[PDB]
Short mmCIF file of C-alpha atoms and ligand atoms in Angstrom, two decimals:
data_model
loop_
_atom_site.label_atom_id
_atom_site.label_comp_id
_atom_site.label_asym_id
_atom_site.label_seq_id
_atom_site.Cartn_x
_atom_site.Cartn_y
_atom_site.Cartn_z
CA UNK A 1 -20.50 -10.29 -30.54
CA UNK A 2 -23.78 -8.65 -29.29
CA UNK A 3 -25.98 -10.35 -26.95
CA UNK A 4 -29.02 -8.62 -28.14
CA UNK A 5 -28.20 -9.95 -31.80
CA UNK A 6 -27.82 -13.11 -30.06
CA UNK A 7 -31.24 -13.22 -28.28
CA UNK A 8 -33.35 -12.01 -31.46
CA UNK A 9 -32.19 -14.44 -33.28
CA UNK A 10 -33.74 -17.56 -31.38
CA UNK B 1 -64.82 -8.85 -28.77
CA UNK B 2 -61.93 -5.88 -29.27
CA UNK B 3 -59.35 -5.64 -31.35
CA UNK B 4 -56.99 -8.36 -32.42
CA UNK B 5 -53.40 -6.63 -32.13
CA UNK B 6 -54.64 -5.31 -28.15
CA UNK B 7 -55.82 -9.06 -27.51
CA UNK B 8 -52.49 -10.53 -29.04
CA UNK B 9 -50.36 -7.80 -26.90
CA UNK B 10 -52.24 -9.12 -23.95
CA UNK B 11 -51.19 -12.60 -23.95
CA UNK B 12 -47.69 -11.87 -25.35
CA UNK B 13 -47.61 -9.71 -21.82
CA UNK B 14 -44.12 -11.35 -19.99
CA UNK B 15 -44.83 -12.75 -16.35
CA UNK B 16 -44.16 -10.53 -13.46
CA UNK B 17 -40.61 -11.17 -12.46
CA UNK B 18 -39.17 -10.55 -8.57
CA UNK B 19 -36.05 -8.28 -7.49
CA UNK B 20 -34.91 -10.75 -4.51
CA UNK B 21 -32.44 -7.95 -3.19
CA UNK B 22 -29.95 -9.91 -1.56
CA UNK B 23 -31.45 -10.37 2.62
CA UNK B 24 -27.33 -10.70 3.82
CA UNK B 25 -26.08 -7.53 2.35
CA UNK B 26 -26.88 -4.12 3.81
CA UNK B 27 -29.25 -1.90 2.70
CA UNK B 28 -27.16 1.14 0.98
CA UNK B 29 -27.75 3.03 -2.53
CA UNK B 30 -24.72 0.18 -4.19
CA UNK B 31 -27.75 -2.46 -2.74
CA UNK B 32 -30.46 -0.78 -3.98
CA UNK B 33 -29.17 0.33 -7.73
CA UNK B 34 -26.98 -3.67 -7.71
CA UNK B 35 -31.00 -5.14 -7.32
CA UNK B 36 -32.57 -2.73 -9.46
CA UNK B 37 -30.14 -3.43 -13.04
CA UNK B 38 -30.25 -7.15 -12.05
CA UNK B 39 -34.03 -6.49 -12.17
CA UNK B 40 -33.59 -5.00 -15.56
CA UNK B 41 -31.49 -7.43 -17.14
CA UNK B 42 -33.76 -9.91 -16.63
CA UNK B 43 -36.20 -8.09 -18.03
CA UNK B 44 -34.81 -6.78 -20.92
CA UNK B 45 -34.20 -11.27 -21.67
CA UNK B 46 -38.28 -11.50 -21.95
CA UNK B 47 -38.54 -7.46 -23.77
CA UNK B 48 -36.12 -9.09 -26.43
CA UNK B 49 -38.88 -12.16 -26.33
CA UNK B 50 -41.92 -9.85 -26.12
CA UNK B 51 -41.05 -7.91 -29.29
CA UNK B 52 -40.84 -10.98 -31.63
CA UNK B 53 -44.99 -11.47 -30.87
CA UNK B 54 -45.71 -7.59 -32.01
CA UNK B 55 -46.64 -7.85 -35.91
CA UNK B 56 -44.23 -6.81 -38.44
CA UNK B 57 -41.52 -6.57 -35.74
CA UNK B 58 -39.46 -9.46 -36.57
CA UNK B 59 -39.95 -8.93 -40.78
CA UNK B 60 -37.72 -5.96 -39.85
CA UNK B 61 -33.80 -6.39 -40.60
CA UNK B 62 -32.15 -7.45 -37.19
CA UNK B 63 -30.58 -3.85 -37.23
CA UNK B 64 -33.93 -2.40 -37.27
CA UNK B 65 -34.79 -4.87 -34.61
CA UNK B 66 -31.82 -3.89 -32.53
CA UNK B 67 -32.49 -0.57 -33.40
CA UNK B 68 -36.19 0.23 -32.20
CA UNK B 69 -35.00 -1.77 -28.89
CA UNK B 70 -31.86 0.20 -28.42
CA UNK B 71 -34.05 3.48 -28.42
CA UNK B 72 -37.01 2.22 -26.33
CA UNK B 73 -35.87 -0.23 -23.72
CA UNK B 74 -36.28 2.20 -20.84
CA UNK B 75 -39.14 3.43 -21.99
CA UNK B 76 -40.28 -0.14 -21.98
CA UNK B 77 -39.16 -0.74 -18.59
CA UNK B 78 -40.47 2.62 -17.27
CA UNK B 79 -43.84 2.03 -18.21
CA UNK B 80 -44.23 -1.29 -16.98
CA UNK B 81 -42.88 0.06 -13.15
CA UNK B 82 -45.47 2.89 -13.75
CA UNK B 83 -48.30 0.37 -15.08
CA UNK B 84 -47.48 -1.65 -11.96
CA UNK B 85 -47.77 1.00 -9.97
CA UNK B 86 -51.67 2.95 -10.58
CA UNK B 87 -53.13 1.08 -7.74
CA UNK B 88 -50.45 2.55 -5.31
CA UNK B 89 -50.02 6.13 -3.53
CA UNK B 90 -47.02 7.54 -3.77
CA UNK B 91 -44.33 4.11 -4.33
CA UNK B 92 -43.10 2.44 -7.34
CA UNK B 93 -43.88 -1.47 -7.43
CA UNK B 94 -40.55 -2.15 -9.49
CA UNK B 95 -41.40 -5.87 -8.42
CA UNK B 96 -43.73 -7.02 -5.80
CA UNK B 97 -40.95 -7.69 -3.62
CA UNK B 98 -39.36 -4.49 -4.44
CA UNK B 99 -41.49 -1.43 -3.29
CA UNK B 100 -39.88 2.19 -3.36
CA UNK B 101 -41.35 5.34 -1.01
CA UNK B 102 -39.27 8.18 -1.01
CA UNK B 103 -37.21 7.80 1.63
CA UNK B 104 -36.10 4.45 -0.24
CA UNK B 105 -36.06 6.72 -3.68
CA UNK B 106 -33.49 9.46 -1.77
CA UNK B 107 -31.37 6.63 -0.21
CA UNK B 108 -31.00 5.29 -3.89
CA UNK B 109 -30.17 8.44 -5.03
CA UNK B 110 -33.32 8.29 -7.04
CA UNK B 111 -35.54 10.69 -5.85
CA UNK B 112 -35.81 13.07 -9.02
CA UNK B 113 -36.18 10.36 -11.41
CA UNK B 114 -38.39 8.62 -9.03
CA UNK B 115 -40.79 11.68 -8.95
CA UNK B 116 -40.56 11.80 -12.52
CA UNK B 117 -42.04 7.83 -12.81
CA UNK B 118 -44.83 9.01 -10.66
CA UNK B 119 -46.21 12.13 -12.79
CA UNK B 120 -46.40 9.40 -14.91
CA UNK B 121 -48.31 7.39 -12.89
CA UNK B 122 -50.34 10.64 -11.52
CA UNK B 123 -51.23 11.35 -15.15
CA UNK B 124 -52.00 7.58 -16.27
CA UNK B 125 -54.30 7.37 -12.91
CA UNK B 126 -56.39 10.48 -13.79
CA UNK B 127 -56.75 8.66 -17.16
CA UNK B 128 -57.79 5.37 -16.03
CA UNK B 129 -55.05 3.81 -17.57
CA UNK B 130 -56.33 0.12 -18.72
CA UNK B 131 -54.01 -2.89 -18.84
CA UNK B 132 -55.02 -3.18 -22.80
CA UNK B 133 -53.88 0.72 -23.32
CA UNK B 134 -50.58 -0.22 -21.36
CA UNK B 135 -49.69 -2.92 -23.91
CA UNK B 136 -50.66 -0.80 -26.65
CA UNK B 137 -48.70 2.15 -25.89
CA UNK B 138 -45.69 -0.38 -24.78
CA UNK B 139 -45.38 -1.91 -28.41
CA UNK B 140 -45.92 1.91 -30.04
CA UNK B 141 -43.25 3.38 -27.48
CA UNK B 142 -41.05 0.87 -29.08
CA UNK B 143 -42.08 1.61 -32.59
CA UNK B 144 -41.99 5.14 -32.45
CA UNK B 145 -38.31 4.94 -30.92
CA UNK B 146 -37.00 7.73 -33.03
CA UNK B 147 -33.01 6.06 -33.33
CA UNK B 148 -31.09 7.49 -35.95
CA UNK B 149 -30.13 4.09 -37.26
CA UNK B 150 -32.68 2.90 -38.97
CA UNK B 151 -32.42 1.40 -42.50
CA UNK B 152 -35.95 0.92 -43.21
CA UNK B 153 -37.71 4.47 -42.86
CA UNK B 154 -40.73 3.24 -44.60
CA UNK B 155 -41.18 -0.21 -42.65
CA UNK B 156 -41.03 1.29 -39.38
CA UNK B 157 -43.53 4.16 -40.23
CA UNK B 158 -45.68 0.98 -41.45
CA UNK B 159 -45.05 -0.72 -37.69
CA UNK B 160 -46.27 2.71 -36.10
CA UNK B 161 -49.48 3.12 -38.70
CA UNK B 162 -50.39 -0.27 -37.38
CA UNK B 163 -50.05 -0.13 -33.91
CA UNK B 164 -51.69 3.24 -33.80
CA UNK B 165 -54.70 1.79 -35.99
CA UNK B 166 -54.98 -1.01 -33.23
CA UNK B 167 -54.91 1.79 -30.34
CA UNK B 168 -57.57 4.28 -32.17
CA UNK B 169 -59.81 0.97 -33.27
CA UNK B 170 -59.66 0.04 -29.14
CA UNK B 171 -60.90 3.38 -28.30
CA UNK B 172 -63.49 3.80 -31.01
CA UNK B 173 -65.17 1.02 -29.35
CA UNK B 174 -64.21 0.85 -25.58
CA UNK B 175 -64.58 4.48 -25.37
CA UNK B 176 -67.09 5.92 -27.11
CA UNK B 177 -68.01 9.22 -24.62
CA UNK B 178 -64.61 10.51 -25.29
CA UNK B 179 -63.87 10.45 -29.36
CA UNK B 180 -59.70 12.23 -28.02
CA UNK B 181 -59.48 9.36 -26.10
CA UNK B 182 -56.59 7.89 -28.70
CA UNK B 183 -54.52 10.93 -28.50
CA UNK B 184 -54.59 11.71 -25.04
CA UNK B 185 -52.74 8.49 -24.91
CA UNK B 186 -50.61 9.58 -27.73
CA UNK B 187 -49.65 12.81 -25.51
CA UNK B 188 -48.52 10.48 -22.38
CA UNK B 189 -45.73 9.34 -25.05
CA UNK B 190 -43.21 12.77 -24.42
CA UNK B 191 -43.22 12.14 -20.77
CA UNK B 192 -42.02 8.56 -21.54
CA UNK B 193 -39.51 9.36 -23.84
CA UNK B 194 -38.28 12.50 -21.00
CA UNK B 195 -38.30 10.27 -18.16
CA UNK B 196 -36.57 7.75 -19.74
CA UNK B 197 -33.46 9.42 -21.49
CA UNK B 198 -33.27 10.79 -17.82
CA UNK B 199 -33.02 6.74 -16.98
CA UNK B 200 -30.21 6.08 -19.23
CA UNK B 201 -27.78 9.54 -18.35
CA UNK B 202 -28.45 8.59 -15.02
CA UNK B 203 -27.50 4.78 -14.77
CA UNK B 204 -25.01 5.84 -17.72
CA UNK B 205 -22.89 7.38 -15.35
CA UNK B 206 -23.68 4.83 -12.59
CA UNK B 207 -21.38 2.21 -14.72
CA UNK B 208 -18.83 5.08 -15.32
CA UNK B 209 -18.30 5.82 -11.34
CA UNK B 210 -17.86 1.45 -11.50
CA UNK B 211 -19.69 0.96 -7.96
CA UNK B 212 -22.32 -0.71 -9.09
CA UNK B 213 -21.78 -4.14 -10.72
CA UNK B 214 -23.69 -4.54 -14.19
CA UNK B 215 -24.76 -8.10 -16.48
CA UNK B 216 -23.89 -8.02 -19.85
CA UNK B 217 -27.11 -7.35 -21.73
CA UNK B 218 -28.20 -4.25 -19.20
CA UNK B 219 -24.67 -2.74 -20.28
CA UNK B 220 -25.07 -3.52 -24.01
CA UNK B 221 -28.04 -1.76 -23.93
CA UNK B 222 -26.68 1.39 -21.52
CA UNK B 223 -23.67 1.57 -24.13
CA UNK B 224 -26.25 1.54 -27.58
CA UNK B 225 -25.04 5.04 -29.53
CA UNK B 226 -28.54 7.51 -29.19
CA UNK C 1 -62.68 27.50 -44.53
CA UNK C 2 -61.36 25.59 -41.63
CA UNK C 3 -61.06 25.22 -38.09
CA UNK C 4 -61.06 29.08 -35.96
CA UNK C 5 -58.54 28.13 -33.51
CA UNK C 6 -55.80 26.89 -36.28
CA UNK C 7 -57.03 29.86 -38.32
CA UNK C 8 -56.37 32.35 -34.87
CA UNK C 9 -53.05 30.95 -34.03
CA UNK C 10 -51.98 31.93 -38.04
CA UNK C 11 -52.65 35.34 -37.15
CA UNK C 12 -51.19 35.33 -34.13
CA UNK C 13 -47.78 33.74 -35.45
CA UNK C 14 -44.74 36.07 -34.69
CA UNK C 15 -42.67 38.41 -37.44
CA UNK C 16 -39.50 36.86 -38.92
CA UNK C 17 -36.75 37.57 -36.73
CA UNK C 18 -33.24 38.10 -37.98
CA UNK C 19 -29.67 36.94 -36.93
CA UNK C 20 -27.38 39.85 -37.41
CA UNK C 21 -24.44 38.12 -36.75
CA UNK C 22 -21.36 40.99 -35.68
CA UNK C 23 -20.03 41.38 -39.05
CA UNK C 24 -16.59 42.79 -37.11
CA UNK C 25 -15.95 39.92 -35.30
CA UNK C 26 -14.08 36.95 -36.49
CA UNK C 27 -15.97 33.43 -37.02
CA UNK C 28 -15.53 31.13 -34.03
CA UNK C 29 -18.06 28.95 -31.63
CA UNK C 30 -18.16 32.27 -29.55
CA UNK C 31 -19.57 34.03 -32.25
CA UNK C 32 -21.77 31.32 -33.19
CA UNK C 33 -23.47 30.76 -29.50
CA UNK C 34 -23.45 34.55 -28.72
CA UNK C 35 -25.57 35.28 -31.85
CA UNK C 36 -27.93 32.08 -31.36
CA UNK C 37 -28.59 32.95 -27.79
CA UNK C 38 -29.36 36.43 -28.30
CA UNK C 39 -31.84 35.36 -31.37
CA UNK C 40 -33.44 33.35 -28.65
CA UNK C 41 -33.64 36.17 -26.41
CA UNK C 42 -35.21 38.20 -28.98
CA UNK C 43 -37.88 35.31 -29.82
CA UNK C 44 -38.57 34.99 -26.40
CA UNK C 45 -40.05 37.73 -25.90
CA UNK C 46 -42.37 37.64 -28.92
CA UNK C 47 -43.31 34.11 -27.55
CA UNK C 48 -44.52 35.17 -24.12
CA UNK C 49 -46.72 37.64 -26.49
CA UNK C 50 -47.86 34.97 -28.55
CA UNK C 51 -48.70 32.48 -26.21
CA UNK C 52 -51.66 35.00 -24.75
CA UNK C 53 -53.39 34.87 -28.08
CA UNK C 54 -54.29 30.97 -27.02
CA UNK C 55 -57.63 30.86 -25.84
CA UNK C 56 -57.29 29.87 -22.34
CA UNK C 57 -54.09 30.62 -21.72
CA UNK C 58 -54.22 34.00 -20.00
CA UNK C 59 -57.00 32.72 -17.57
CA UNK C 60 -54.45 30.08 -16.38
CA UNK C 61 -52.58 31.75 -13.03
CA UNK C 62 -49.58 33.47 -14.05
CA UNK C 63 -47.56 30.50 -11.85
CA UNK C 64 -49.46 28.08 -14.27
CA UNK C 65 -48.30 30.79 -17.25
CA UNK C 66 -44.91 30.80 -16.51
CA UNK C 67 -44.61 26.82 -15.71
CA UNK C 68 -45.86 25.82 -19.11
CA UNK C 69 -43.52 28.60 -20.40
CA UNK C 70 -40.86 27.54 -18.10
CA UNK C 71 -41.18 23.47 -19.35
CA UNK C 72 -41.91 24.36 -23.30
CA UNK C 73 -39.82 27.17 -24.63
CA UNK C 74 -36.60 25.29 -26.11
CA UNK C 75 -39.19 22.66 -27.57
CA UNK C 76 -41.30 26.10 -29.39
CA UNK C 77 -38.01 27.52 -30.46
CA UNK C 78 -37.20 24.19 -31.89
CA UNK C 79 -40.06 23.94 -34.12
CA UNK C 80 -39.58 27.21 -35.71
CA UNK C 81 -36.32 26.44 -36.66
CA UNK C 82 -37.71 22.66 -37.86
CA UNK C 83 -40.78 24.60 -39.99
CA UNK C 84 -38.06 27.00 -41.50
CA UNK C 85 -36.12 24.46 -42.75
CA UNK C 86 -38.62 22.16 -44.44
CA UNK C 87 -37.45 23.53 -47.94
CA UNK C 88 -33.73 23.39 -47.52
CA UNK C 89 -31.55 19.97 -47.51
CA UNK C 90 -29.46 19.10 -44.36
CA UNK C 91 -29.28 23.00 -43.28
CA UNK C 92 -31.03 25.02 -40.57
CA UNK C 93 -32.93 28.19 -40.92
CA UNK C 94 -31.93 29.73 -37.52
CA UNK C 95 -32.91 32.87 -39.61
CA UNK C 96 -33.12 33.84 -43.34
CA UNK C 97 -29.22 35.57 -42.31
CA UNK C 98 -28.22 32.20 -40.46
CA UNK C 99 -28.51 29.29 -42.50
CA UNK C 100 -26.04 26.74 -40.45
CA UNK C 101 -24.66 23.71 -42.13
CA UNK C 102 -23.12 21.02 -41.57
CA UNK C 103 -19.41 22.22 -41.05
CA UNK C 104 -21.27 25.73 -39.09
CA UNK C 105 -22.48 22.74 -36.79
CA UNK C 106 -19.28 21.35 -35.90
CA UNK C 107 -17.14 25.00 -35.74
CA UNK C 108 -20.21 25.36 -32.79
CA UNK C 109 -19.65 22.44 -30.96
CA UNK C 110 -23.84 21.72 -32.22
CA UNK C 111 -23.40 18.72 -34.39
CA UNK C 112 -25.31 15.71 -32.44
CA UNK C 113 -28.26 18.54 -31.20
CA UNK C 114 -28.34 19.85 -34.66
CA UNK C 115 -28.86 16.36 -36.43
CA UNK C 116 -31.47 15.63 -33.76
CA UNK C 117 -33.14 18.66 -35.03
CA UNK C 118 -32.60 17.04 -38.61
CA UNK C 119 -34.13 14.06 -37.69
CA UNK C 120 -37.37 16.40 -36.64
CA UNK C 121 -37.15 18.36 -40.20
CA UNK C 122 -36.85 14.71 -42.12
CA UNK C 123 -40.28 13.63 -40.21
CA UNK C 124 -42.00 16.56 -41.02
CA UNK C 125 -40.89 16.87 -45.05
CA UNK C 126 -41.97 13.00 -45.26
CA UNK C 127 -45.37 13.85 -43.49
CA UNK C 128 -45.23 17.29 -45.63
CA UNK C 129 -46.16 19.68 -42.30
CA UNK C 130 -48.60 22.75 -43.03
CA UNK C 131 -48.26 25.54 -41.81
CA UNK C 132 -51.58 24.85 -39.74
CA UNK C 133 -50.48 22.05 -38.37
CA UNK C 134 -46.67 23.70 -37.18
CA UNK C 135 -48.77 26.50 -35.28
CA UNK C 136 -51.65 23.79 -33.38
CA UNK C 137 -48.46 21.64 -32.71
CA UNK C 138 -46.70 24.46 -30.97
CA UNK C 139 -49.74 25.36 -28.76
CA UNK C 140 -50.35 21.77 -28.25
CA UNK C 141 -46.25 21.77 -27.09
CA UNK C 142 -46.48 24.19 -24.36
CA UNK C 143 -50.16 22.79 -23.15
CA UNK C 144 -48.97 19.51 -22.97
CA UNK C 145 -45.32 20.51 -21.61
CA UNK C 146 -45.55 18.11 -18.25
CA UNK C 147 -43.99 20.89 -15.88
CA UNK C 148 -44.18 19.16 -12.23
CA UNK C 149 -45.00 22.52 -10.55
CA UNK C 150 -48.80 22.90 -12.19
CA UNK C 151 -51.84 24.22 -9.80
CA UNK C 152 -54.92 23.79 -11.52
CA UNK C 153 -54.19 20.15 -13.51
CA UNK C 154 -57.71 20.69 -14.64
CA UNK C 155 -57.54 23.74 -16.45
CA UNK C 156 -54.30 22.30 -17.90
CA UNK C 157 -55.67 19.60 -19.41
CA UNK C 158 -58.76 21.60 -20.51
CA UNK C 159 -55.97 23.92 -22.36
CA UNK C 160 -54.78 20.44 -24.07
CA UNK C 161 -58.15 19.00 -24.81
CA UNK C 162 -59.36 22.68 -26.40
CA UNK C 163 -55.90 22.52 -28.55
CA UNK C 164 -55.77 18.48 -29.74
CA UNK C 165 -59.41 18.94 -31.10
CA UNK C 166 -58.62 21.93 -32.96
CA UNK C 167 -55.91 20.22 -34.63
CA UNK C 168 -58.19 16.57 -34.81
CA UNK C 169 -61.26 18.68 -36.61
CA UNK C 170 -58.48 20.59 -38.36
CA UNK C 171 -56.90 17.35 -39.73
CA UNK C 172 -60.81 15.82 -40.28
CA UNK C 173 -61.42 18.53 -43.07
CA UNK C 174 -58.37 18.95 -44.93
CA UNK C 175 -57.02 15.25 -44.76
CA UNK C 176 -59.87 12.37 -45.25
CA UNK C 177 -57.24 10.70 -46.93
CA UNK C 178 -55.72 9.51 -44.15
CA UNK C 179 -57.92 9.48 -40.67
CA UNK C 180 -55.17 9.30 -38.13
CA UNK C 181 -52.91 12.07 -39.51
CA UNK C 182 -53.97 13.93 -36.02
CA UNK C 183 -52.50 10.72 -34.42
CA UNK C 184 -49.57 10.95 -36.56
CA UNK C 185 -49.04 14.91 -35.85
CA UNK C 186 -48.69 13.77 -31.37
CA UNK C 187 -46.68 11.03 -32.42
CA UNK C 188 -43.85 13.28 -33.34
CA UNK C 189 -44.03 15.12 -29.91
CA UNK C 190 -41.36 12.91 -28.30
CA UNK C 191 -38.24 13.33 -30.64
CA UNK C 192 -39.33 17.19 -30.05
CA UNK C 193 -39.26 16.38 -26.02
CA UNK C 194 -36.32 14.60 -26.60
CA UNK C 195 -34.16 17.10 -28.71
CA UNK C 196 -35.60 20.33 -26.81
CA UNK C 197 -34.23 18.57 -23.02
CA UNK C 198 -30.80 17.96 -24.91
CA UNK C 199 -30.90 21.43 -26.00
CA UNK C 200 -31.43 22.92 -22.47
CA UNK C 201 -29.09 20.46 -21.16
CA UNK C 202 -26.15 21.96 -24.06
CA UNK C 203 -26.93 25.82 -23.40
CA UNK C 204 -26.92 25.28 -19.39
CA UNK C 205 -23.52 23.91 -19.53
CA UNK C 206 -22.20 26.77 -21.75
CA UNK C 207 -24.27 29.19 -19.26
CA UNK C 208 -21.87 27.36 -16.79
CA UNK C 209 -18.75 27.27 -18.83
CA UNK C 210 -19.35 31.36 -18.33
CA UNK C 211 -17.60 32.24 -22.00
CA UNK C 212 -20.92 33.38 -23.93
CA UNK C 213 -22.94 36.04 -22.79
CA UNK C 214 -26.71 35.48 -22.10
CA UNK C 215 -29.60 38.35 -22.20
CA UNK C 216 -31.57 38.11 -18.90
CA UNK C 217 -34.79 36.55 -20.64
CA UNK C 218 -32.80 33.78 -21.68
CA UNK C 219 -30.49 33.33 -18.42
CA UNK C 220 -34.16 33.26 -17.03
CA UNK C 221 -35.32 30.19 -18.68
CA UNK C 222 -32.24 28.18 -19.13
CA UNK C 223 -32.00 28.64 -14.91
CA UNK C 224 -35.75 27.74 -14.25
CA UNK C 225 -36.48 24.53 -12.06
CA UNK C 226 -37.61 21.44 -14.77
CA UNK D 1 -38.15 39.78 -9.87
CA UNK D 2 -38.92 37.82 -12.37
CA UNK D 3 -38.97 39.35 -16.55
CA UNK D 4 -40.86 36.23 -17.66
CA UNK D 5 -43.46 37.19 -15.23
CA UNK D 6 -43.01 41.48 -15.73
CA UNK D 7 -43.93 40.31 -19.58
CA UNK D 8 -46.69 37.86 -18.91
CA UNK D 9 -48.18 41.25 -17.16
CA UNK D 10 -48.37 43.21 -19.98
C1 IND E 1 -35.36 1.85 -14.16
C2 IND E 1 -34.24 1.24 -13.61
C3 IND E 1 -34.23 -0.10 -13.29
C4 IND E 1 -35.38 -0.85 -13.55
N1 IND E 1 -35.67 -2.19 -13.34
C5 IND E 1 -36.95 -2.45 -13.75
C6 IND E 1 -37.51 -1.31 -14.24
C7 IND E 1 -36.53 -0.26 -14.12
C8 IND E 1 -36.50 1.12 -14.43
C1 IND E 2 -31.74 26.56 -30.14
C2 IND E 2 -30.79 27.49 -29.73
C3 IND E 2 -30.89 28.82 -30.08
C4 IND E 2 -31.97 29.22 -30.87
N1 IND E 2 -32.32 30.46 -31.38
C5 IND E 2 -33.48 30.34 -32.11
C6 IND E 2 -33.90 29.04 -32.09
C7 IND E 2 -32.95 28.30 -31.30
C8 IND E 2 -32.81 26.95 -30.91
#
């Protein structure tokens, strides 16, 4: 699953 | 004083981040282009970051969020190589370690895109471009993104209305002997968005030909539907 | 009354232009390219006409003349079609005889460029575009077109300052509501960049592809140097 | 030579 997704949700 | 949103832009601004091409490998265009989406993956880590701090940003649904970045992340990129760059004649400082002329910009294969960053630059230098109008224009670049995949129409019109208040408020009071001062800025933005979808075709179909080895977020973004 | 420039360019706005799609020849993409490309042809010319009625203009050097014409064309064709379809729901007014929807998109290979110029119409309906403000925003597109073979930069951006405060004391009388509805008005500049470059990009290749014939106005600008 | 230009001449 996305990384961008990942890193705006920290 | 000045405005709150340009102040708060200002020291949400990421730190300047080196290329480090690699000193063992030859130069060649696979060198150059390998150094310059390394440079922009690591970039677009501390964009993601940078976006939180803008107001209203993060009250968006993540698809929004995704969204507005998906559109604008060269745009973001672009303007911080051009911002970089006033102070220059004739190079791009994508880094301070990472200066392009134009015999470096036709070795890359770069040299039309390259000339297109620098009528940027040309345009933003007749201007006087100041780092709290860079900032500005960075966060409404993003908000005025234009994907098709947005979910909240209204919200995002809301993001731009404030982020163009903040730039016209600036100006009002920084700039008082020229009243157009806000929307000359305002007409820098079609260049942006030119040079940039330019950007993405062309590194597009850099990671089609496969030469040039790619990290995962800089292909995420290079394979976002626009 | 209001603002002499907005009120000149009214007067100078072209006739309606029709279609006249071959009524002998059978539907195809063919059909549909031929008879959009020779409507452009035809606009064309009443464009070069037009754009002489912009104070300033004409004193530019003809190279100037024919750069900003060069860089802005597709981008003042675009908004006529946008302004002509601000009534109608998820068709364009090519011409009051070529009203394409959806499924007229596709049979032309035009889908993605046509729902880019959707995107433009749905911005303009939500900010409810005048008729004033469609004819300052086309002279404002081909002053502010960013062709990289300009002589006099100066008068350029003279021919950009002249037209942005004609539409900024234009939008001062007729909209205190809302103070940065000029600001608003540049802002949507960039999708029109965006979609007009995709649109010269799409025609070029079918110029290439060598199966629909082009007038020599048209050939002309799809083949000039941007 | 050029019809963009012949028209801009009239
Ligand atoms: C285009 C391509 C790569 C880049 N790396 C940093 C900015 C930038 C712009
Ligand atoms: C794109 C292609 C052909 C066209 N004819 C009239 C407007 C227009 C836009």
């Amino acid at each position: 699953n996305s990384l961008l997704l990942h890193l705006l949700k920290s | 004083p000045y405005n709150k949103i340009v102040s708060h832009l200002l020291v949400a601004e990421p730190e300047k981040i080196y290329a480090m091409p690699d000193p063992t490998v030859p130069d060649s265009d696979i060198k150059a282009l390998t150094t310059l989406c390394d440079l922009a993956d690591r970039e677009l880590v501390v964009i993601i970051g940078w976006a939180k701090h803008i107001p209203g940003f993060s009250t968006l649904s993540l698809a929004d969020q995704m969204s507005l970045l998906q559109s604008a992340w060269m745009e973001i990129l672009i303007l911080g190589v051009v911002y970089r760059s006033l102070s220059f004649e004739d190079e791009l400082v994508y880094a301070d370690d990472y200066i392009m002329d134009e015999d470096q910009s036709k070795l890359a294969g770069l040299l039309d895109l390259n000339n297109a960053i620098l009528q940027l630059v040309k345009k933003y230098k007749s201007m006087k471009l100041e780092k709290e109008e860079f900032v500005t224009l960075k966060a409404i670049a993003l908000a005025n993104s234009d994907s098709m995949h947005i979910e909240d129409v209204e919200a995002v019109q809301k993001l731009q209305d404030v982020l163009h208040e903040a730039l016209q408020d600036y100006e009002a009071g920084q700039h008082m002997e020229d009243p157009r001062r806000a929307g000359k800025m305002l007409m820098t933005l079609p260049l942006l968005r030119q040079t940039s979808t330019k950007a993405v075709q062309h590194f597009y179909n850099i990671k089609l030909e496969g030469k040039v080895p790619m990290h995962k977020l800089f292909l995420e973004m290079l394979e976002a539907k626009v």
